[PDB]
Amino acid sequence: EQKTVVVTTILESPYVMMKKNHEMLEGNERYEGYCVDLAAEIAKHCGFKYKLTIVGDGKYGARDADTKIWNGMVGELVYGKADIAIAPLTITLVREEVIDFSKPFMSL
Amino acid sequence: QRKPCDTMKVGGNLDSKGYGIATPKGSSLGTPVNLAVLKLSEQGVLDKLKNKWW
Amino acid sequence: QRKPCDTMKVGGNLDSKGYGIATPKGSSLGTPVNLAVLKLSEQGVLDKLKNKWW
């Protein structure tokens, strides 16, 4: 009956900031920031339960050579460590063909 | 804005691109968050966040 | 860049937007048109025409 999801985010200082009590908090409390309160607003509208996590590779990361096998942040979606990504990540067809994307939230 | 103010832009920037939320193919979560993003996009709440964080 | 050359841009772009070809609601040719657009994009003719005209 119940369901939960895992979220990917990144500690980019404009978008996510490490709260001073960083020793022992959970990712749903470890963090604040534009991505964090955007995610909170999205969950406020959509109602789903979630947990925030950093990208486990901790980086954008490159394509695997001659294979384009995905980096950590994309692989955590495609290989089920997470089910949604809410991060400063560039829209491109070379990614859209592999995974779906929302409407952009900013233009830059 | 993060002091020391010893860095600066020059030139009129290079391109225009979007940032958005993403979701793997077939995941049910996709459209019910996409509609929420549309809600925020039309309600303009993002302007509060931009003010708060820049 | 035209002959009079008596005016100039100032600053960068204020925002970002894009053009799209448009047709009335549900026009059945629109998807063939979308395919034509996609192919002309992939063929780079969007570069060709601008490089001709500008």
Which of A32, A37, A41 has the highest number of chain B CBs within 10 A, making it the mutation to test binding with B? A41
C15: nearest CA partner in chain B? B16
Distance CA A2, CA A95 (A): 31
Adjacent-strand bridge partners of A51 = A6
* Residue labelled with tokens 């942040």: A73
Both tokens of A52, joined, read 């925030």
B contacts of C19 (beta carbons < 8 Å)? none
Strand pairing category for A31-32 and A106-107: unpaired
- Asked if B17 lies within 8 A of A108 by C-beta distance, the reply is yes
Torsion of CA A80, B49, B18, A40, to 10 degrees: 20
Adjacent-strand bridge partners of A17 = A32
Whether A54 contacts A27, CB under 8 Å: yes
Whether A37 contacts B48, CB under 8 Å: no
* Residue labelled with tokens 């067809």: A93
Which of C14, C15, C16, C19 has the highest number of chain B CBs within 10 A, making it the mutation to test binding with B? C16
* Overall size of chain C counted in residues: 54
Experimental technique behind these coordinates:
cryo-EM
* CA dihedral sign of residues A71, A73, A79, A85: negative
Q: Is A30 annotated as a binding residue?
A: no
